[PDB]
Amino acid sequence: RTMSENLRRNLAALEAKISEAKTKKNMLQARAKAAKANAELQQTLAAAAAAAAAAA
Amino acid sequence: GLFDRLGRVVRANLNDLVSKAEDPEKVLEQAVIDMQEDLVQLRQAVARTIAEEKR
Amino acid sequence: FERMENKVLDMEATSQAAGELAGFGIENQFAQLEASSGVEDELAALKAS
Numbered sequence A: 001r002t003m004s005e006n007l008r009r010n011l012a013a014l015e016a017k018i019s020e021a022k023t024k025k026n027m028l029q030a031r032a033k034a035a036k037a038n039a040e041l042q043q044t045l046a047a048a049a050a051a052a053a054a055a056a
Numbered sequence B: 001g002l003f004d005r006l007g008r009v010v011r012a013n014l015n016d017l018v019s020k021a022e023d024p025e026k027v028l029e030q031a032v033i034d035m036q037e038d039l040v041q042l043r044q045a046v047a048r049t050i051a052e053e054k055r
Numbered sequence C: 001f002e003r004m005e006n007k008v009l010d011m012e013a014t015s016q017a018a019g020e021l022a023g024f025g026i027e028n029q030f031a032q033l034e035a036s037s038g039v040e041d042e043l044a045a046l047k048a049s
Helices: A003-052 B002-018 B024-054 C003-022 C026-030 C038-048
Strands: none
Touching: A003 B024, A003 C003, B024 C003
């Protein structure tokens, strides 16, 4: 009964950090979609400037 | 040892080769799934020891 | 999870820096000025009518 107190605290400390992890997951998955959309845009502007149709 | 040093080189390349297969978007939610069911297993084992203190 | 968070922060910074640097340059910067189109004289001459 001195062990079950230790385990019973360790069990609650785990679920506390699952809750934090799950809130951060949402914010990170948002940032990864935004960054990937901007990468495709900046690649499009480069290829346009490389064709330079207005110089021809 | 020389073959320790070669081992740690070849082992580190293989571990890096895996690390860049991890897609941040897929693995980051699987990690939370795994960490949730770990708590389901743990709670069963704890309760099984509480039953015996009672007994 | 922590190892995968750093990958996300690397992508975000790489995108933002390339976009920020392309935000410099004379044409893109002048394009942000309101009266930048250069017809304000004939526009004014029309407004006079």
